[PDB]
Design a protein around this motif. Structure first.
Motif, short mmCIF file in Angstrom:
data_model
loop_
_atom_site.label_atom_id
_atom_site.label_comp_id
_atom_site.label_asym_id
_atom_site.label_seq_id
_atom_site.Cartn_x
_atom_site.Cartn_y
_atom_site.Cartn_z
N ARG A 1 72.70 132.07 -5.25
CA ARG A 1 72.16 132.38 -3.93
C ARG A 1 70.91 133.25 -4.00
NH1 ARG A 1 75.52 131.37 -0.03
NH2 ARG A 1 77.36 132.32 -1.00
N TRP A 2 69.97 132.98 -3.09
CA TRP A 2 68.83 133.85 -2.82
C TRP A 2 69.03 134.54 -1.48
CZ3 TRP A 2 63.90 133.49 -5.65
CH2 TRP A 2 63.92 132.53 -6.68
N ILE A 3 68.68 135.82 -1.44
CA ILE A 3 68.57 136.58 -0.21
C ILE A 3 67.12 137.06 -0.18
CG2 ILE A 3 69.42 138.55 1.12
CD1 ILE A 3 72.02 138.38 -0.60
N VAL A 4 66.26 136.34 0.54
CA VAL A 4 64.82 136.58 0.51
C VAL A 4 64.37 137.09 1.86
CG1 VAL A 4 62.55 135.57 0.28
CG2 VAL A 4 64.39 134.89 -1.29
N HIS A 5 63.72 138.24 1.86
CA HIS A 5 63.21 138.82 3.09
C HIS A 5 62.31 137.83 3.82
CE1 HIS A 5 61.48 141.49 5.98
NE2 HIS A 5 60.29 141.50 5.41
N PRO A 6 62.59 137.49 5.09
CA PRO A 6 61.72 136.55 5.82
C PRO A 6 60.44 137.21 6.31
CG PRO A 6 63.46 137.30 7.23
CD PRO A 6 63.76 137.89 5.89
N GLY A 7 59.48 137.38 5.41
CA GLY A 7 58.18 137.87 5.86
C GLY A 7 57.64 137.04 7.00
N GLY A 8 57.97 135.78 7.00
CA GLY A 8 57.58 134.86 8.04
C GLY A 8 57.90 133.45 7.52
N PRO A 9 57.74 132.41 8.36
CA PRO A 9 57.94 131.04 7.87
C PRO A 9 57.09 130.74 6.65
CG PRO A 9 56.66 131.17 9.92
CD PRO A 9 57.44 132.42 9.80
N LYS A 10 55.83 131.19 6.63
CA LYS A 10 54.94 130.93 5.50
C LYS A 10 55.41 131.63 4.23
CE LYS A 10 53.21 134.89 7.45
NZ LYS A 10 53.06 135.35 8.86
N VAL A 11 55.90 132.86 4.34
CA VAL A 11 56.42 133.57 3.17
C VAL A 11 57.60 132.81 2.58
CG1 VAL A 11 57.62 135.63 2.42
CG2 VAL A 11 55.59 135.86 3.83
N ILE A 12 58.53 132.38 3.44
CA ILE A 12 59.69 131.63 2.98
C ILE A 12 59.25 130.34 2.30
CG2 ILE A 12 61.76 130.41 3.70
CD1 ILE A 12 61.68 132.54 6.17
N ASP A 13 58.30 129.63 2.93
CA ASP A 13 57.81 128.38 2.36
C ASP A 13 57.19 128.61 0.99
OD1 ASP A 13 58.67 127.09 4.68
OD2 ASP A 13 56.69 127.19 5.62
N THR A 14 56.46 129.72 0.85
CA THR A 14 55.82 130.04 -0.42
C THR A 14 56.84 130.28 -1.51
OG1 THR A 14 53.89 130.95 0.70
CG2 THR A 14 54.27 131.64 -1.59
N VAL A 15 57.90 131.02 -1.21
CA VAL A 15 58.96 131.22 -2.21
C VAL A 15 59.60 129.88 -2.58
CG1 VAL A 15 61.04 132.49 -2.75
CG2 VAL A 15 59.30 133.51 -1.28
N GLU A 16 59.88 129.06 -1.56
CA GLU A 16 60.44 127.73 -1.78
C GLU A 16 59.59 126.92 -2.75
OE1 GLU A 16 60.98 124.58 1.48
OE2 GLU A 16 62.51 126.10 1.90
N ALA A 17 58.29 126.83 -2.47
CA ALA A 17 57.38 126.06 -3.30
C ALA A 17 57.25 126.67 -4.69
CB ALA A 17 56.01 125.96 -2.63
N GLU A 18 57.10 127.99 -4.77
CA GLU A 18 56.88 128.64 -6.05
C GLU A 18 58.05 128.44 -7.01
OE1 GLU A 18 54.03 130.39 -7.47
OE2 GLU A 18 53.43 128.98 -5.91
N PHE A 19 59.28 128.37 -6.50
CA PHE A 19 60.42 128.24 -7.40
C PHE A 19 61.08 126.87 -7.36
CE2 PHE A 19 59.80 132.76 -6.98
CZ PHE A 19 59.98 133.21 -8.28
N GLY A 20 60.46 125.89 -6.70
CA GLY A 20 61.01 124.54 -6.67
C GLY A 20 62.37 124.48 -6.02
N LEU A 21 62.56 125.20 -4.94
CA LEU A 21 63.89 125.35 -4.37
C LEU A 21 64.19 124.20 -3.42
CD1 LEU A 21 64.48 129.12 -3.77
CD2 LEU A 21 65.15 127.65 -5.65
N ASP A 22 65.47 123.88 -3.30
CA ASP A 22 65.94 122.94 -2.30
C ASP A 22 65.67 123.50 -0.91
OD1 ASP A 22 67.42 120.74 -1.09
OD2 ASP A 22 69.07 122.17 -0.85
#
Lengths: 368, 363
Positions: free
Chosen positions: A288-309
């Motif tokens: 599991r990831w618990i990632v601070h929602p800086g915003g939709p763009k921040v979340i998307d960036t983490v998703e893309a950077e780590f190849g997440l589902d």
């Protein structure tokens, strides 16, 4: 290692849906006869993906009495959160060795010192009052307390994070927005500034979260509790100006520049991959990831950077949808959700990730 | 245990005599024609026993508050960088070899001062940070305590603490506005008289400066036997004393006279306890280092522990040469002691809360 025993949260009374807040800001735009597209308010209040926010300070003063109210609300929410944490763990206030706090609310003395006059901690309680960390504080706090408990394995410690973002609605947003739209035809350069102030208005909310952690030898440190096995900090050089909180004459201004999500890419991977590597684990190993929602763009960036589902960060979007961005408390609130209504396989791995001013990021490796 | 290996200071360019600063305030009183006895200025500027003070910010008939905070921020950064670089050079310690940077300052900074310094000094991008606030003049002593606890679990690591305060920001408009609003409201409400004197005492007392200290764990190569070890530390908070000391938002320093009395409630329970669990009597202490909130605080500590009047002389000397520079004072004091035998000592400071911090050192 340090164990996460339990968590709690506290929220103010008034919950406004996002459309009501946008209508309020539009009303202010119309009443002052400001010349800015009213639909630009709605676009950014809608595309931040927040359904409604808690505001401790009224939507209907002096900067002095506003800060005094915010101090009072900060203390109230922190007290409530700590009290319910103590009651749900059946832990007496005099058995707590360290009380750690993160909050941008001005408080000298700090909120933790102030709380010792409403909760019967011992007079020799150690305190860890931190600031200058903004949105990362929640995760930041866990790390600091974790480090503390390495040398104090018999002790219990409480961390709380409380923020009053609605204080920006007590004049700062209004004064700054009026001046900026004033100068927009004089100097179109300031358009991007108004957007910033609108995005801030669309984004930030009030709340408090709390967490009890114990050292290894503490009687509450049982199997099946999340263990903090490591943590790490990272600061992206030459990014001070991208994020923060400046004190201005009438109040504060919130700095959140559009570059943030791109700037975060510079730190996310070396931080996390380095941490996990130094614990002989890969990012794919995380349950599991618990990632601070800086915003939709921040979340998307983490998703893309780590190849997440596309479901891996749904808790970030869910949290942001229900309470907005409550800054340092958000991750604690998320951790609370995970501990209270989600199921974790034994010995699985989790990762708390937060970003904030500096531009700095914190990463904490949990183990169930 | 944790060793203190070195210290450093940093001060602004301008050192004003206390007579000049008192005259500056009297000038402001007179140009505004404020109906208040100006001889109360001299009195409290004289009674604080400060001969001069460094002021980072211009000496006032005020710029914007945002601009004043910008200047305070940049000056705090400058001071901390100067002190940190001196500390590193005098120890021949590479910034990459520092594991923790702890900061205390009342200068508002989001992100914190320690974060911004990583762009001035080549700390590694993963530097641990401990940015603290809400502690006022206790911060120096407070900082040492929190660093010691850290190095308890990281025995071969190095940490740096810096404390930096810009009191002169309060001369950039806050004191003038408050004093005028109080004085031309005094005829209506004679209760405001106390409020005026407090401001004068604030104007009389606080100063600008910075200190830094390098601390190491026990397995660190720098942990030589000539250096003092932090062997224990304790903290104490006097219940229901929030309104006695603090800083409220410009800003307004809060320092009520009752502090001196409420101070007695905390000191002896704190210190006597800390010594007692360390098998130490207050009399066999080689040295004391007490934050000089004011000569009345120093005299209170002296009487409460029955000390020889030379035992706290360092506090009076410090207050005379640099005034009250808040959390940095006790670092500036420690810097003196290190640079000026199986014996114990203690660092004592007090600040908002009302809180007190005590540290037991062994040389």
């Amino acid at each position: 290692m340090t164990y996460i025993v339990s968590t709690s949260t506290a929220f103010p009374e008034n919950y406004y849906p996002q459309t009501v807040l946008a209508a309020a800001l539009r009303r202010f735009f119309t009443v002052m006869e400001l010349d800015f597209d009213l639909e630009q308010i709605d676009r950014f209040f809608t595309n931040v993906k927040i359904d409604g926010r808690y505001f401790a300070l009224p939507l209907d003063p002096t900067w002095g009495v506003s800060i005094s109210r915010g101090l009072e609300n900060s203390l109230n929410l922190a007290e409530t959160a700590i009290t319910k944490l103590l009651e749900k763990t059946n832990v007496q206030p005099q058995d707590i060795s360290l009380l750690a706090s993160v909050s941008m609310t001005p408080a000298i003395p700090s909120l933790d010192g102030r709380l010792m006059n409403r909760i019967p901690f011992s007079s020799t309680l150690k305190r860890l009052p931190m600031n200058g960390v903004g949105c990362m504080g929640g995760a930041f706090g866990i790390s600091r307390v974790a480090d503390y408990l390495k040398a104090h394995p018999k002790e219990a410690a409480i961390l709380f994070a409380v923020e009053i973002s609605s204080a920006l609605w007590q004049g700062s947003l209004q004064a700054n927005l009026t001046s900026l739209i004033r100068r927009l035809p004089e100097n179109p350069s300031l358009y991007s500034e108004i957007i910033m102030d609108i995005i801030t208005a669309a984004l930030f909310a009030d709340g408090c979260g709390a967490v009890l952690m114990v050292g290894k030898e503490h009687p509450l440190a049982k199997s099946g509790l999340p263990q903090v096995i490591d943590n790490r900090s990272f600061l992206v050089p030459n990014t001070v100006e991208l994020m923060g909180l400046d004190v201005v004459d009438n109040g504060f201004r919130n700095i959140l520049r559009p570059e943030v999500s791109d700037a975060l890419k510079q730190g996310l991977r070396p931080l996390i991959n380095g941490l996990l590597a130094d614990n002989n684990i890969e990012s794919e190993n995380l349950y599991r990831w618990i990632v601070h929602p800086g915003g939709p763009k921040v979340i998307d960036t983490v998703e893309a950077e780590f190849g997440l589902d596309s479901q891996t960060l749904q808790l970030s979007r869910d949290t942001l949808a229900e309470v907005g961005n409550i800054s340092s408390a958000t991750v604690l609130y998320m951790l609370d959700k995970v501990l209270s209504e989600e199921q974790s396989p034994p010995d699985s791995y989790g990762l708390i990730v937060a970003m904030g001013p500096g531009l700095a990021q914190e990463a904490i490796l949990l183990k169930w």
